Amino acid sequence: NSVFFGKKKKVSLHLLVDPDMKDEIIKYAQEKDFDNVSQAGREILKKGLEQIA
Amino acid sequence: ENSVFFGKKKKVSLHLLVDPDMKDEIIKYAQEKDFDNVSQAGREILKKGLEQIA
DNA sequence: ACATGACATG
DNA sequence: ACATGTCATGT
C-alpha cells in the first residue's frame, strides 16, 4: 500500500447509508485513522469482506 | 414528513476511494446477493465489518 | 494521488 | 428518496 510508482489509483465508491452507520464509521476514523473517513471505510469494508470469505 | 415520525431514517452519502480490487469484490458480492445493487452490498458489508469492531 | 461534497443524470 | 458518476476545491 501507500506511495510507489505504477501503483493503481483508487476508484470511487459512492453510496447512501443510515446515519447511525456513517457515525460509527466516523468515530472509528477519528480513533484509528486520523479522521480519514475513507481510510476507515476501507478497513471496515475489508473486515466485512473476510466475514463473507 | 410522515415516514419520519415513525422512525424512517433518510440515508446519507458516504463517498470514498477504494482499491480497484476491493471494489471488484464488493461488486461480485452485489451480483451474488443484491441484484448488482452495489450500494446495498456496501451497506451489508460495512455492517458486518462494524459488527466485528464493537 | 486522495478526501470530501456539491452537482448531475437515470 | 435511491443509485452511481463526474466536478471541483484544498491536501
List, in order of start, the domains of chain A with CATH numbers. 1-53 (1.10.1220.10)
Cβ(B5)–Cβ(B21) under 8 Å? no
Report the alpha-carbon distance of residue A24 to residue B38 in Å, rounded: 20
Cβ(A45)–Cβ(B45) under 8 Å? yes
Residues 4-23 of chain A within 7 A of strand C, judged by CB, are 7, 9-10, 12, 14
Residue in the block written with cell 469492531: B53
Based on the number of CB atoms within 10 Å of its own CB, is A34 exposed (0-12), middle (13-18) or buried (19 or more)?
Answer: exposed
Size of interface A-B (CB pairs under 8 A): 121
Method of determination is X-ray
Question: Alpha helix (H) ranges present in chain A?
Answer: 19-32, 37-50
- Beta-sheet strands, E only, within chain B: 12-18
Cβ(A34)–Cβ(A41) under 8 Å? no
Longest distance between any two alpha carbons in chain A, whole Å: 38
What is the structure's resolution, reported in angstroms to one decimal?
Answer: 2.3
Q: What are residue A16's phi and psi, to 5 degrees? A: -90, 135
How distant, in Å, are the alpha carbons of A5, A16, B13, B25, B27 from that of B49? 31, 17, 18, 15, 17
Cβ(B25)–Cβ(A49) under 8 Å? yes
Return the nearest residue to C1, CA–C1': A9
Strand partners, B15: A14
Q: Which nucleotide is nearest to B1 (CA to C1')?
A: D1
Report the alpha-carbon distance of residue B45 to residue A5 in Å, rounded: 31
Report the alpha-carbon distance of residue A31 to residue A26 in Å, rounded: 9
Residues whose beta carbon sits under 7 Å from strand D: A 12, 14-16; B 3, 10-11, 13, 15, 30, 36-40
Residue in the block written with cell 456496501: B42
- Give the Cβ contact number of residue A30 at 10 Å: 12
